[PDB]
Amino acid sequence: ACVHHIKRRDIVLKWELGEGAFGKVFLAECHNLLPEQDKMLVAVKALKESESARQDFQREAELLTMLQHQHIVRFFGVCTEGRPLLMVFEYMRHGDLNRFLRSHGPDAGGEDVAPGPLGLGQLLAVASQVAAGMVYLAGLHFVHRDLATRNCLVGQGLVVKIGDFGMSRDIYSTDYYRVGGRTMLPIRWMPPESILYRKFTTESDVWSFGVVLWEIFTYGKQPWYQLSNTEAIDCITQGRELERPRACPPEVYAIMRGCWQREPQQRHSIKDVHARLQALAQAPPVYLDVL
Numbered sequence: 001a002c003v004h005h006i007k008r009r010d011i012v013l014k015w016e017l018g019e020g021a022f023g024k025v026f027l028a029e030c031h032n033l034l035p036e037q038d039k040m041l042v043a044v045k046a047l048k049e050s051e052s053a054r055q056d057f058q059r060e061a062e063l064l065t066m067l068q069h070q071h072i073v074r075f076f077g078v079c080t081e082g083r084p085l086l087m088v089f090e091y092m093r094h095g096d097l098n099r100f101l102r103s104h105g106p107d108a109g110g111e112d113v114a115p116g117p118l119g120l121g122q123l124l125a126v127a128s129q130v131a132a133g134m135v136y137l138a139g140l141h142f143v144h145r146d147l148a149t150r151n152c153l154v155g156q157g158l159v160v161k162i163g164d165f166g167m168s169r170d171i172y173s174t175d176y177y178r179v180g181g182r183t184m185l186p187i188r189w190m191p192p193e194s195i196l197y198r199k200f201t202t203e204s205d206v207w208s209f210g211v212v213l214w215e216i217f218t219y220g221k222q223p224w225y226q227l228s229n230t231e232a233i234d235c236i237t238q239g240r241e242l243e244r245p246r247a248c249p250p251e252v253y254a255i256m257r258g259c260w261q262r263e264p265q266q267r268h269s270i271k272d273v274h275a276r277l278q279a280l281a282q283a284p285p286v287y288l289d290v291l
C-alpha cells in the first residue's frame, strides 16, 4: 500500500509503556525519521499474533496515513521487514486525557501545567482541540463510534489529539458493556438511536462529544457511575440526562444540552459547537471570570 516504511535498524527499543490484549507499546529511539531531528523519541506498537490480524494491521496503517490532521494522532509509518510488525507513533508525554484529567482534579504543578485543578480557560482549551478534530472527521464523513477521553492523548504544551486504542478495552474494561462474546459497546457514550436501533452516524458522534464535554468538567468521572450497565441503558433510552458539574458554567452546559437533543436531526453541528468553544477558550480573563 501507499504507507511510509521504516527500517528496523533505525528503531531501538528502550522499555515497555503499556500492554493490551492485542498489542504492546514501547518507548524507543528512531534515527533519521525527521530532517531537523537526528535522534527523537517515539511510541512503537508491536502487533500480537494469526493470519486474520495481519489484514487488520493493514487497514489501520492506510486509514491512519490518509486521516492525518493537526488534532488527530500522528503516525510516521510501519516496519514490515521481519516479524513482529511495528507501527511507529509520535510519543505523547502525559498519556491519555482521562488519566491527565484525574491527576489534575479537585483532589488537590509542573512544566506544562500550573499546580492544583485545571482552570476554566485550560479546560476549555482541551474541549476545543478535541472538537477541532471531530470537525475534520465529520468533513470527510468518517464515523468514530467510540469517542471518549480514554481515546485521546495529551502532549507537551497540552496538545490534545484524537485516536482509537485497543488498550482501552483492557485498561478501561468497566467503560464497555460486553455483548455476544467478543463485542463491547460503550453504552454510556452512545445516544438513544444507537442503543435501540444500532445506527451510528455523524449525529451519534456529536452526542458522544457532549459526553466528552461532561467528562472534562468533572475531571474524568465516568458518566452514570452510580448506575449499572442495564440501569444506564434504561436511563438513556427513557430520556434522562446528566447533571451540570460544579466546575461547568451555565453557558458551557447549554452546549452539552445542544449535543443531547433526542431526535438526531435537531442536534447541533460539530462546526458550530467548535465555534463556541474556540471563541470561549480565546476570550480574555475579564470575560471568563464573570462566566
Ligand SMILES: CC(C)(C)c1cc(NC(=O)COC(=O)c2ccc(-n3cnnn3)cc2)n(-c2ccccc2)n1
Binding pocket: 017, 025, 043, 045, 059, 060, 063, 064, 067, 072, 073, 089, 090, 091, 092, 093, 095, 144, 153, 162, 163, 164, 165
Ligand atoms: C483516526 C481515527 C481516530 C479514526 C483512528 C485511529 C486509529 N488507530 C489508533 O488510534 C492506533 O493508535 C495507537 O495504536 C497508539 C498507541 C500508543 C500511542 N502512544 C502512547 N504514548 N504515546 N503515543 C499512540 C498511538 N483508528 C483505528 C482504525 C482501525 C482499527 C483500529 C484503530 N482510527
